[PDB]
C-alpha cells in the first residue's frame, strides 16, 4: 500500500539527461535522492520562486488573495498566455513572470531580504535586482534546499498564516484526481531552455510526499519526468 522510498530506482528517467530527483515520505520521514552530487548544487530557481513570492506577498498584504488582478500593459511577450490580465493564481499557473515582478517590487528589497533569511532560501542573494534576482541571476538554491523548504510548506510549519499557506497550495494544484492531488510549480531558464525544475508535493490516500526534480533541460521535461515517476510508483493513480 505505502510506497517505501528507500526501495526505488529512477535511473532510466535520466539516462539522457543531467538531472536529480528527490522524494520525501512525510509519514515515514525518509528521503530518496537520485544523483546526490547534482542535488547539492545550488542553481537559479527560475519560476519555482513564485511559491516564495506568493507566500511573502500574501503574508505582507502586497496582494489580497489568489484573484488579485494586475492589468496587462499590452506588450506582447514570449508566451501568449502571458498577454492578458493576470492574477496571483493565474500567473502561477501560466508562469506569467511580469505579474510576479510587480509583486516583488511591492515587497521591496529590505522585506525580501529579511524573509529569505527567515526561510533559509539558498544563498539568499538578491543583488541581481528586486525583480530579476530569481531569473538566471544572483539567487541560487540547491535541489535539496528546495526540498527542505517545500517540506516545511507541506507540513505548514512555516511562519505564514494558515490561510496564506492554504491559498498558495491551492494555486499550486496541477491535478485533482479521485484518489490524489498533485501540487507543483515548474521553472525554466527561458534564455536557452537549459535549466528546468518541477517542485511540489502529492497527497494520496496512503501518505503525502514532497518532490524536487531539476534537469539541464526545460521545466516541461522536469515535470514529465516527475509525473512518469509518480505514476510508476503508484502515487498518481486516478
Residues making up the binding site for substrate: 185-187
Choose among 123, 119, 131, 197: nearest CA to 165: 119
Q: Map grid coordinates 497550495 to a residue.
A: 169
Residues 5-232, CATH architecture? 3-Layer(aba) Sandwich (3.40)
Choose among 185, 183, 148, 191: nearest CA to 26: 148
Quote the CA–CA distance of 39 and 36 in Å, as a whole number.
Answer: 5
Whether residue 196 contacts residue 211, with contact meaning beta carbons closer than 8 Å, is answered with no
Residues making up the binding site: 185-187
Q: Please count the CA atoms within 13 angstroms of the CA of 97 that sit on its side-chain side.
A: 21
Choose among 102, 85, 113: nearest CA to 50: 102
Whether residue 222 contacts residue 185, with contact meaning beta carbons closer than 8 Å, is answered with no
Rounding to the nearest 10 degrees, give the CA dihedral for residues 8, 201, 220, 128: -120
The catalytic residue positions are 47
The technique is X-ray
Domain ranges of the chain: 5-232
Amino acid at each position: 500500500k505505502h510506497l517505501n522510498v528507500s526501495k526505488m530506482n529512477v535511473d532510466d528517467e535520466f539516462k539522457d539527461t543531467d538531472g536529480t530527483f528527490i522524494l520525501h515520505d512525510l509519514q515515514k520521514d525518509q528521503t530518496f535522492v537520485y544523483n546526490r552530487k547534482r542535488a547539492n548544487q545550488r542553481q537559479t530557481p527560475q519560476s519555482t520562486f513564485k511559491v516564495v513570492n506568493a507566500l511573502i506577498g500574501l503574508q505582507v498584504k502586497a496582494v489580497r488573495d489568489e484573484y488579485d488582478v494586475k492589468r496587462w500593459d499590452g506588450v506582447k511577450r514570449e508566451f501568449e498566455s502571458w498577454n492578458r490580465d493576470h492574477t496571483l493564481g493565474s500567473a502561477m499557473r501560466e508562469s506569467a513572470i511580469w505579474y510576479y515582478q510587480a509583486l516583488a517590487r511591492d515587497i521591496g528589497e529590505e522585506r525580501m531580504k529579511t524573509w529569505l533569511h527567515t526561510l533559509s532560501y539558498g544563498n539568499e542573494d538578491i543583488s541581481g535586482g528586486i525583480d530579476q534576482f530569481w531569473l538566471q541571476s544572483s539567487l541560487t538554491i540547491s535541489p535539496l534546499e528546495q526540498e527542505t523548504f517545500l517540506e516545511k510548506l507541506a507540513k505548514e510549519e512555516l511562519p505564514f498564516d494558515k490561510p496564506v499557506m492554504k491559498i498558495v497550495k491551492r494555486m499550486m494544484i496541477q491535478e485533482e484526481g479521485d484518489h490524489y492531488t498533485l501540487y507543483g510549480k515548474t521553472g525554466t531558464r527561458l534564455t536557452d531552455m537549459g535549466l528546468g525544475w518541477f517542485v511540489g508535493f502529492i497527497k494520496t490516500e496512503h501518505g503525502s510526499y514532497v518532490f524536487v526534480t531539476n534537469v539541464d533541460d526545460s521545466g516541461t521535461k522536469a515535470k514529465n519526468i516527475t509525473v512518469d515517476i509518480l505514476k510508476k510508483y503508484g502515487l498518481i493513480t486516478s
